[PDB]
Structure 1
């Protein structure tokens, strides 16, 4: 079978299984979930750990005594269960004060507050043992063209991130940052809308080695992009610091379906890529059990994220191990794609008549790529029909 165990490193955001089902047209359909109950039940399902926004753990506005009491109760639940906390983030989107952004709010007083709120939670993240601190700039953006000077907003975003890197560096903390792109919602357009924009922005920070990306399946798909391809570019760059796994059925609002729902073939190729690459990060789910579900449907959904990952892993492993698939991969020249084009160097290339005057373009054009048969073997393996 497909039973998850903590060795699989599956993690969940507290706000996932804790989502009360309030949407923009509907009230809450489930009662608030105690974080301690979340830790306990996810451990029972075979999870490895949980993640949190500051405000999922400590009530906004808590005195120091309440903050300590909440953190202490949470840590007792982690310690009883053996659950970890690999990742933390700040809620810089719920409160009305962030309605124009946090790090890129036009009001400087809000930007300063946003940094202080984040810094206090970095300290908490280190205390809990989190190794990655995620930033999701969901209010960073605009609905109209004059409301945000995007060059100046990138200056402010770079300034915020540099100050956070200086903080971590001055404290000696072992924590790294992961930026989560999203193209829109809740703003009309969000800054750093894709894996690409976020990776490019990182290269202009003071201490770029401290920053990577936290890509979410559904966010890339909201722009109609190929999520496995984006993940491959993050991997190629050495910047895949964390991931959010879920599902999305098209270009529309952010659905956060359980992983495996949505674009099932994309989920298979994503699992094939993470496993083939030997990526060792947490398999973290950022999903919302639909508001139609009661608390039992919540745990079914959570269990289903893990189950789908493990089925897909089994199928992708069987695909790569199949000598008929490996022969189809060679027939499609995947092996040549991994060979240098010109290890002989530019001068040898420029001298080589087989690369130009003697290159038979018509014979080369006649060769089929044999991609359809290869894709059908992949479909057979995914469906268990080999």
Structure 2
């Protein structure tokens, strides 16, 4: 009954189940979790693996000696459990030095420091077997218009990613980068605020093939955008390297609810798309168990993430396999959308009088699209009423 196994490739950040519940108006409600005990509990729940920021694993300020001991203990828990580490990332947002950004801070010495801190963790990520390195530029942005010349900031952002790409290629590392967009919070506006802006930026990097996106459900919904549409555009471009799954109720602060909460129908269409496009990367949950919960609620919330994915996967598969839905898709001409508009070419199109001079515009306009019947079949499948 909807039991996950490591083959489902569900992964969790250390910072998710480990969130202590500090919010802008309140103190922590839970004690800190040892990363080793998070790895063990997640493995018992059926997770495939974990992800980390450098500072989740190695306390900021650690000596190289304490650093080695933190990595060894972590490594041992991975060996004991069979858990993988498919992704890692850098914390360039918590320490006060990053208050105006890391890669795009106005102070040049901070930008250099941000790069060195990142490169140090790329080495560790490769040693732990990560295939994707995520960058979330949470402090890159501004609260006021004169504080940041955005063209100069984009030059500095390109410079930083180009240097990271030079570093990995000169070291011979098999790791790719994924940029995680977010429109706002904690800065008033964040640079590269949506999937689209990140995809466009990547095309100006020196080695674009090294870079993709790590979209997050709740972040695109903070701009009121359709998250499955944005994922479709990222798949179309060949750039969906990783994904952050969670829930969000509309345009407000980043809630990071468990996956399936928030916009449930969008979650259904997302799962339908990922499974039908054969996305084979990790199903990563970037979520926060609400601070109302004790540790039992933390693990219940994490389990719910995986459960809801598997229920939606079953419902989406039943939807696509239903002969009545396949009939309705043809009734709505989804088959015709997949056929070229003009494989006969420009000149044939220009000479084709059925395309314009003799086109019966009133008869075409009268044809219903039958989209409402199709959408009710999708609702019936989602609710198990079929």
TM-score w.r.t. the length of structure 2 is: 1.00
Matches of 1:23 and 1:190, distance apart in 2:
20
Matches of 1:333 and 1:79, distance apart in 2:
52
Q: How far did 1:356 drift?
A: 0.4
* Residues paired across the two proteins, number: 386
SS in 2 for 1:133: strand
Matches within 5 A, 1:144-159: 144-159=144-159
Matches of 1:65 and 1:335, distance apart in 2:
61
Q: Deviations over 1:248-305 (max 9, x none)?
A: 0010000000000000000000000000000101000000000000000000000000
The answer for unaligned runs of 5 or more in structure 1 is: none
Runs of 4 or more above 4 Å deviation: none
Q: How far did 1:15 drift?
A: 0.2
Q: How far did 1:186 drift?
A: 0.2
Q: Deviations over 1:329-376 (max 9, x none)?
A: 000000000000000000101110110001100000000000000000
Matches within 5 A, 1:231-310: 231-310=231-310
SS in 2 for 1:61: coil
Matches of 2:354 and 2:308, distance apart in 1:
49
Q: How far did 1:224 drift?
A: 0.1
Matches of 1:359 and 1:61, distance apart in 2:
72
RMSD value, Cα: 0.3
SS in 2 for 1:122: helix
What's the counterpart of residue 2 of structure 2?
Answer: 2
Q: How far did 1:62 drift?
A: 0.5
Q: How far did 1:194 drift?
A: 0.1
Matches within 5 A, 1:1-386: 1-386=1-386
Matches of 2:350 and 2:293, distance apart in 1:
65
SS in 2 for 1:373: helix
Q: How far did 1:170 drift?
A: 0.4
Q: Deviations over 1:89-127 (max 9, x none)?
A: 000000000000000000000000000000000000000
SS in 1 for 2:369: coil
SS in 1 for 2:146: coil
Q: Deviations over 1:22-46 (max 9, x none)?
A: 0000000000001001000000000
Q: How far did 1:381 drift?
A: 0.2
Matches of 1:13 and 1:363, distance apart in 2:
55
Matches of 1:39 and 1:49, distance apart in 2:
8
The answer for unaligned runs of 5 or more in structure 2 is: none
Matches of 1:37 and 1:338, distance apart in 2:
49
Q: How far did 1:240 drift?
A: 0.2
Matches of 1:349 and 1:79, distance apart in 2:
62
Matches of 1:39 and 1:208, distance apart in 2:
34
